[model samples]
Target: KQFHTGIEIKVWAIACFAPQRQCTEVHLKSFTEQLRKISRDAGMPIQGQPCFCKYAQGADSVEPMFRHLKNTYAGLQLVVVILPGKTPVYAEVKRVGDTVLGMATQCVQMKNVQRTTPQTLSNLCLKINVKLG
Candidate 1:
């Protein structure tokens, strides 16, 4: 049987795991703010509750959090994962959620480790907007 149970996915969940070596807390916060704005502009705003967005510590943290979301949020439609680069967390999220649990995943990489500027967020928004659409 389909896990979604014929219910259309209408909400989004955003997850981030960029170790301090890659991104700062301020940067992550700004990135999330921009993401919210662009998501709203695109008409598929991520589910606003705190759980919809999370800051994970490591690849080991990915599976459990996503699993929790899947169990907690009944109508979860998509997962937007923000990463510091090509990391194991990104792959693990897909492995656990997409392959094992059957959830949609979109992983966005933070190309420039030095900064997570508004422009970076804007470019990311562009890509995600298309995917969400």
Candidate 2:
């Protein structure tokens, strides 16, 4: 825990995804609040008010979106994608994040995004620290 206390990360913004057809806009406050707390619990506190947007698009659109995100935001750190369990978007997200841009992309389920827990948040910060390290 002490290891985490010394580190601090700033989240510029988060791009979330969901089915456009569904009436499902999870509580962003709920998600980001826990995201902040657990990050501190991990000893890696995240700073700044994270900006977010609903990412509603197809598999092929991910690459362009990634490109846009890369070129757009300044000092951006992570891209958090809310998912619908399993979909081709996951693969495309990796394709753009891992192979193309090499950015930190955290894909979280919609359920967890709606009701986040410490276990998941702790785990999330783990990758975030390493991914950005």
Q: Could you say which candidate leads in lDDT? A: 2
| TM-score of every prediction relative to native | 0.64, 0.82
Q: For residues 35-103, could you state the per-residue lDDT of candidate 1 as single tens digits?
A: 666555555554333347667878899888888889889867788777876677877887987678988
Q: How accurate is candidate 2 locally (lDDT)?
A: 0.72
lDDT of 2 at 16: 61
What residue pairs clash in candidate 2, if any at all?
4-43, 5-43
lDDT of 1 at 6: 23
lDDT of 1: 0.66
Question: Across residues 78-110, which tens digit of lDDT does each residue of candidate 2 receive?
Answer: 888777677888999998899999877888787
Model 2 scores worst on lDDT over the 10 consecutive residues at 20-29
